């Protein structure tokens, strides 16, 4: 009924959504990442930072990875 004793696993934390249900949501620890500027993803899209890529990875693209640092071409 709450986020109590819920273990969402890695890269995920527990949060009550608007309907009052506990949900594990993607929430990568950005303080763990050392490169802070933008990155270019394997989908060819630039992501604002690496943390943002990791969230897209957890949420919608399991194979997404950083292909190079900086903006994509």
Kindly report the CATH number assigned to the domain that includes residue 8.
3.30.60.30
- What does residue 66 show for φ and ψ, rounded to 5 degrees? -80, 130
53 burial class (0-12, 13-18, 19+ CB within 10 angstroms)?
buried
8 and 14 in contact (C-beta within 8 Å)?
yes
Question: For residue 38, what are the domain limits?
Answer: 1-73
- Return the sign of the alpha-carbon dihedral for residues 29, 35, 41, 47: positive
CA–CA gap between residue 10 and residue 22 (Å, rounded): 16
How many domains does the chain contain in total?
1
- What residues are paired with 13 via a beta bridge? 25
Distance of CA 24 to the CA centre of its chain: 12
Q: How far is CA 70 from CA 7, 13, 45, 47, 51, in A?
A: 34, 28, 11, 9, 14
What string of H, E and C letters represents the secondary structure of 6-54?
CCCCCCEEEEECCCCCEEEEECCCHHHCCCCCCEEECCCCEECCHHHHH
Experimental method: X-ray
Resolution in Å, one decimal, please.
Answer: 2.1
For residue 35, give both structure tokens.
Answer: 């490169």
């Amino acid at each position: 009924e709450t986020c109590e004793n819920v273990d969402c696993g890695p890269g995920k934390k527990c949060r009550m959504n608007k309907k009052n249900k506990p949900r594990c949501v993607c929430a990568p620890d950005c303080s763990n990442i050392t490169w802070k500027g933008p990155v270019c993803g394997l989908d060819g899209k630039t992501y604002r930072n690496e943390c943002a890529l990791l969230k897209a990875r957890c949420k919608e693209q399991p194979e997404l990875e950083v292909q190079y640092q900086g903006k994509c071409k």
